């Protein structure tokens, strides 16, 4: 079967989606540690606006705290509470 | 409230997830058209391996056909049936 255009358009339009985000990119400064898991499932803005001068961006944000294994190689490991950004509402906005 | 380490690990480990994929990246050689929507929801391999020698890759693939608006800017538009790759099973494998 073929996915109908209005279904594709609708499912793909700018909204909060579960996205796997590399932790090192949320904490670009933390070279001291490796993280396990190396990435976390965050609700984030994805999809398309269908207008190259619009972009899908967050209007309403929250924090979520996760326990992440932090390994300092050849020194030790522990589990640390880490904070991430999440997107609750997304709108298409001028760039 | 705090996400427990074994839940984070488990939700984030290499598996098929709904991912919004830019169409131009699935058809990099396209020079005639722009697409509306510019991206499609595909089941794809995501997540992490805990292992800087492993990567999350598909073992079992399928096709899905969607109707996509194709616009040749300043010339016209139509709707075309387009084929995309989907990932049914993901495993972590040497690079």
């Amino acid at each position, epitope marked *: 079967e073929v996915v109908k255009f209005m279904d594709v358009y609708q499912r793909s339009y700018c909204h909060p989606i579960e996205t796997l985000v590399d932790i090192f990119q949320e904490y670009p400064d933390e070279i001291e540690y490796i993280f396990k898991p190396s990435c976390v499932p965050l609700m984030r803005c994805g999809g398309c606006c269908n207008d190259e001068g619009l972009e899908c961006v967050p209007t309403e944000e929250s924090n979520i705290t996760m326990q992440i294994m932090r390994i300092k190689p050849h020194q*030790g*490991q*522990h*589990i*640390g*509470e880490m904070s991430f950004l999440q997107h609750n509402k997304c709108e298409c906005r001028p760039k | 409230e705090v996400v427990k380490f074994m839940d984070v690990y488990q939700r984030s480990y290499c598996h098929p997830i709904e991912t919004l994929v830019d169409i131009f990246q699935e058809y990099p050689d396209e020079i005639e058209y722009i697409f509306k929507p510019s991206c499609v929801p595909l089941m794809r391999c995501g997540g992490c391996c*805990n292992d800087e020698g492993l990567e999350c890759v598909p073992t079992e693939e399928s096709n899905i056909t969607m109707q996509i608006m194709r616009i040749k800017p300043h010339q016209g538009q139509h709707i075309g049936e387009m084929s995309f790759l989907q990932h049914n099973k993901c495993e972590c494998r040497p690079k």
Partner: antibody, heavy 119, light 112 residues
């Protein structure tokens, strides 16, 4: 998965002795190997650790400059070379692994080998 | 260089009792931090055996009467239903840093 130490025995103060730890069911290449000792009636005292691939080593202060830890990946065997032994070094010596590079706990221990430092 | 202080040094408990043993890190570590301690059991003339790792995870093959918890500086090993075969010395270990270090131990005797 197993570790089997050998080489313990009687040795005189000032002397030297080398211990061996043979692994089976895993490759020591993939993990850390530790020595830990236990003086008679006392607790556990970590002595040394190795990362076999690149040969990185770490030692307790109490044995620094006297003991050396090494691993032969082809023989799947680790070693503790003990020099300048004193009576206080007398103890059961255990070999232990971490399970992987990303694990700093010790999940498999050998049976231990007694070292007696006396004249 | 982190010392671990284990308590009690010794105890006597009966078969079926819930036994709780404690470990404390010498360095100030916040409660957001956890999972840096392992617990071992050592029977007479035997090698130590891993019971709990990363603070609260039960090692493969260990009876489920064993558990652990903790954060910050403070960790606990619990034996929910003490058995005669649980006579041993119990040791904690930290691997927040290297050198890894062990508590001095807790001698569990079975009261009968």
């Amino acid at each position: 998965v197993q570790l089997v130490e050998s080489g313990g025995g009687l040795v005189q103060p000032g002397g030297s002795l080398r211990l061996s730890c043979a692994a089976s069911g895993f490759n020591i290449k993939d993990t850390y190997i530790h020595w830990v000792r236990q003086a008679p009636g006392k607790g556990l005292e970590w002595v040394a650790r190795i990362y076999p691939t690149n040969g990185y080593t770490r030692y307790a202060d109490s044995v620094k400059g006297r003991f050396t830890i090494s691993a032969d990946t082809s023989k799947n065997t680790a070693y503790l070379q003990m020099n300048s032994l004193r009576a206080e070094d007398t103890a059961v010596y255990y070999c232990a692994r971490g399970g992987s590079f990303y694990y700093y706990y010790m999940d498999v221990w050998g049976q231990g080998t007694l070292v007696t430092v006396s004249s | 260089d982190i010392q671990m202080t284990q308590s009690p040094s010794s105890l006597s408990a009966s078969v079926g009792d819930r036994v709780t043993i404690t470990c404390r890190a010498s360095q100030d570590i916040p409660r957001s931090i956890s999972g840096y301690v392992a617990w071992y059991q050592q029977k007479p003339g035997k090698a130590p055996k891993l019971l709990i790792y990363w603070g609260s995870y039960l090692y493969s093959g260990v009876p489920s009467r064993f558990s652990g918890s903790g954060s910050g500086t403070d960790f606990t090993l619990t034996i929910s239903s003490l058995q005669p075969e649980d006579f041993a010395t119990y040791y904690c270990q930290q691997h927040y840093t290297t050198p890894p270090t062990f508590g001095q131990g807790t001698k569990v005797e079975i009261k009968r």
